[PDB]
Structures are given as structure tokens and as C-alpha cells.
Amino acid sequence: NLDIIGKRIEKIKQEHETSWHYDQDHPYKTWAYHGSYETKSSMVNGVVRLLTKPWDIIPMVTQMAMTKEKVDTRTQEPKEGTKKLMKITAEWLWKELGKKKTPRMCTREEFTRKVRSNAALGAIWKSAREAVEDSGFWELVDKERNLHLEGKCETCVYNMMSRAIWYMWLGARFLEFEALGFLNEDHWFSRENSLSGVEGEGLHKLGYILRDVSKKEGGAMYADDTAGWDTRITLEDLKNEEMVTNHMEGEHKKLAEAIFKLTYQNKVVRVQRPTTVMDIISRRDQRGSGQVVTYGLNTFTNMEAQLIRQMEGEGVFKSIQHLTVTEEIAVKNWLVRVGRERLSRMAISGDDCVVKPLDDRFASALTALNDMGKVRKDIQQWEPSRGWNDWTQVPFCSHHFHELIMKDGRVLVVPCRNQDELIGRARISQGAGWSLRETACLGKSYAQMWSLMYFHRRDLRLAANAICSAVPSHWVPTSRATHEWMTTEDMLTVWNRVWIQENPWMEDKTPVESWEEIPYLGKREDQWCGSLIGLTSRATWAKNIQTAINQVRSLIGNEEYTDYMPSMKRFRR
Ligand SMILES: CNS(=O)(=O)c1cccc(C)c1F
Ligand SMILES: [Cl-]
Ligand SMILES: [Zn+2]
Ligand SMILES: [Zn+2]
């Protein structure tokens, strides 16, 4: 309690000694309130919208551009038998992830380049590029760093703003990255290294990965989402995640222990309240970390929870109230004998999972999952999970996957989602102050992603070609999974590299010579997934596409353009 968060709290009060008021009407029950002080949207991409006119009248698209009680909740302490299961599983899982990896500190150098190459670090000097080029900031970091080496914290404070992001100042983010960045930077949750993980795999790999699991003898495929995963992270989960420090040494060990002890297991947050007074609250549970460390620790704790749910379905342990000495031996023998095989039966991305268990007893194995506080979304606490019998219907990372056979018999496994969602996201730009050129380059990034991932959707291949015809040929795609669409190289060359050359599920490496040789979903399958084909508006839009292309060209001005439309059969002369 206050010994660990006091200094942070004291520093904030003193800097607002002319507003501090211990309001006794504070809405917090689960968050400790300490005091208060006085304080005080999504834009449309016009290039994408002008080239997607039929969607101007589709509410699912247009509503996406318009525009709690979860955070203020407490998860009960797991039973003793649950706690033992979690500790034994976490210990074994860090050892497996560590067999072929070395924990190491990340560098100012690595962090500096990251800020220059742009990446969502969630930080609060105008920008962060300037601070990185200011030795005063690094002296600030140094002070905090020596504070952390002494088991104390001064400036590592969260800011609150199914989604609530916790931003810290760049300095606090550096110290987090220094200590724990290795998890992401060195690919600890890669499929090679973790067996269940998919970190760095790419959307053109996830479908093949789900298909390989399918191959494994067993029951249905289960894909239960957790209700607000970050809010259900227990202090017991935070302490099992901290055991990664047991694989560390010297300074690094001490710096990592301090991030876990001082910023994760004992948080401090500023939240704006309109009644506007900045509220200084604290708690010892729930997920609070950078988005990227959040991803790796979410993947770890999800892998642990799913391997236990698999042990419950196999009857490795009878009761979660207490674990017999014999049951502990059985759990350990299970992990040593089949742990790796059981991790290979899952695909886990943060709080998202697909499990192909040994059989369907998994569906009603719910005691350990519920008691860890990982309560399933949109189903009764004790109702058995509904599994999937077809890998092409399993939801994962907001997608499903189709098996598509090319005219030459080679097999593509392609990512897919409702096309209204794809068009509605491409029509939105984050932040404002965008020039026409910057807006066009963001439209081109979406168009190139569509050509690479969603080429099998008739409307997206046409709109992608239209956008790439409407934006100057040499303008570079921008943005504010691996992103092979972020390039000025020809998209047919990238397609061949991604789907043929570098694709380990494709034995025959014969290049594709034109877009013609790249297939679509069946017409009915296209419609089922939101294609507008068969509609008067869509056909007029395809027939008159050169007119829409010319409207956008006229707005951008006299630039060098390419006509990509003759890459499609119909638009050839
Ligand atoms: C322009 N839309 S369309 O002419 O209706 C159409 C385009 C592509 C495929 C089909 C089956 C179709 F009906
Ligand atoms: Cl099914
Ligand atoms: Zn600190
Ligand atoms: Zn689909």
C-alpha cells in the first residue's frame, strides 16, 4: 500500500497544492481514492469514401464513422488448489519459453529508432521524437532508474482515457521497454518458440495455422472469448507473470522486478471526471502496462489458463479447492510428458484463443476457468461451451478463413471478415491535421492491404485497383501481424513473395504471372460475406469506375498516375 505509491501520490499533490480536495462523493468502490485537483474523434478518409460510393447507403459502414462499470470491478481470490495449478503451470511455461531464448535489456538506441519509425507506445517536448533528442529527458530517466534500483518509484503514473487505454510518460515507457521489451523484440510468443503463440505470424499465416491444428485428432475446436480479459487479471496472475524475472540476472533482474512490484502489482492512475477534477486512485490488480507488454503477458496467462482447462477435461485433477500431493505429481508429469503436444493444439493471440482438445470433455470443464476469474462472454457461467466442427467457421483475431483452390490446383488459405467491417475501417482516419497527400497515402495502405489479404473478395479487389489508380503511382503508403503491404514495390511481386515464395505450406514455387491467375471466393460465398454483387448500385459503380478514379485524380491534381483497372478481366480493352 502507501509505502510503495506514497512518493508518487505526494509528488502529484505538491505540484497541485492550489486545488487538492479529498472529495467524499467519489464514485470509486474497488479503486482506492487518495485525492483530487482541478484540470480541463474519428474523421472520414475522403479518398476511400469517394471510391466506395455504393457503401454510402449501408448503415453498417456509415455508422462506424459516427460517435465504465467494467474497470470499477474486483475479481475474487482463487481457491488454494487453483493457485497451486497456476504456479506449477506458470513455472513450467517460463522454463519452456526460456529454453531457446535469453532475457536481455532493450536499449535507448532501440527505443529511439522505434519512436522515429512510428509505433503506438501510448505516451503523453511537443512530441516524443523531440524528447529522445534531449539529454535532459534521459537524465530524468536515470533519476527514476536509480529510484527503481532502490525499490522506489516517483513518476511511473498511468492515465485513463471494452476499451480503456493507460498512457504513461515516455520515460516510464522506456523503463518498461528496457526491462520487458525482449518478450516482443525477441519473439518469445512466436509459434516456433511458444507452440501456441502466433506473434509475428501475419494474417496470411493464421488460416494455415488453424488448419494444421484441425489435422490433430481430438474433439471440436473451442473459441471462447473472456468477458473484459484485462479487468479479470488477478494479483495471482501478476505474480505468476513476474516469475519471468527468475530467468534474469544482475541489473536486468532488478529493473524487471521493480516494473512488476512498483508499476504492475501496485498501480497509480489519474482519471478525469466531468463533475473536471483529475482523480488520483490506486489498485493492486487488473492489467496495467504498455499495449505491447500487455500482449505478451496476456498470451502467457491465456496459454496457462487454457493448458489447465485441458488438464481439467482430461481429469488430471478432481477439485480446485485443494490439490493432493499425488495430484501435484500428476500435473507435473502431465506437463513434462504432454505439455508441448497440448500447447501445439492451441492458437493464442493475447486474450484470444482457439483450442482443439483431446476430446469434448473440455466443453464442460469450467471450475478452474471460472475460479481463475476468466469468465466466458455471452454464455451462462455453468453452461458447456459450444465448439466448432469446421476450422473454416472458427473465429480468431476478428477473422475466419476460407480454403481457396487456384486454377493450377495449389491451395490458398485466406483471411476473411464481413466486408462492411473492412470498408467501414478503411473510411476512417485517426487524428486530424491530415493533408490531402497524407489522406491519399493512408487510402493506398488500405488498398494494398486489400490486394494482399482480401484479393478473393470481388468488391475489395476492384476498389483496391481503383484507389491505387486514383493515388499517384510513386506516393508511399502511410499509417499513424507483419505489414508487407507497406511498400512501393509492385503488389503482384509482393503477392508472389507472400503467398508462393515464403509460404511454407506451398511445395510448388511457380510464380503467378498476372492477377487473372489469382482466384476469388465462390460468388455465393462472396455475398454471404457482405459482397454487394448482384446489386444495381454495385454494377453501375464497377461500370463507371474510371469516372470515380478521374474525380479523385482531379482533386489531387496533375501528378503521375497508373491505370491498374486492366489487371482485371472485364476492364481490359
Ligand atoms: C458489377 N456487379 S455485377 O455486374 O452484378 C457482378 C459483378 C461480378 C460478379 C457477379 C456475379 C456480378 F453479378
Ligand atoms: Cl461448425
Ligand atoms: Zn517509477
Ligand atoms: Zn468469409
From TrEMBL:
Record localization: Host endoplasmic reticulum membrane; Host mitochondrion; Host nucleus; Secreted
UniProt-annotated binding residues for Zn(2+) 1: 144, 148, 153, 156
Binding site for Zn(2+) 2: 400, 402, 416, 529
Residues at which Mg(2+) 2 binds: 225, 352
Domain of life: Viruses
Residue positions binding Mg(2+) 1: 225-226, 351
RdRp catalytic domain segment(s): 219-365
Residue positions binding CTP: 163, 228-230, 298, 377
Job description of the protein: Regulates the ATPase activity of the NS3 helicase activity. NS4A allows NS3 helicase to conserve energy during unwinding. Plays a role in the inhibition of the host innate immune response. Interacts with host MAVS and thereby prevents the interaction between RIGI and MAVS. In turn, IFN-beta production is impaired. Interacts with host AUP1 which mediates induction of lipophagy in host cells and facilitates production of virus progeny particles.
The protein's assembly and partners: Homodimer; in the endoplasmic reticulum and Golgi. Interacts with protein prM. Interacts with non-structural protein 1. Interacts (via N-terminus) with serine protease NS3.
Protein name per its UniProtKB record: Genome polyprotein
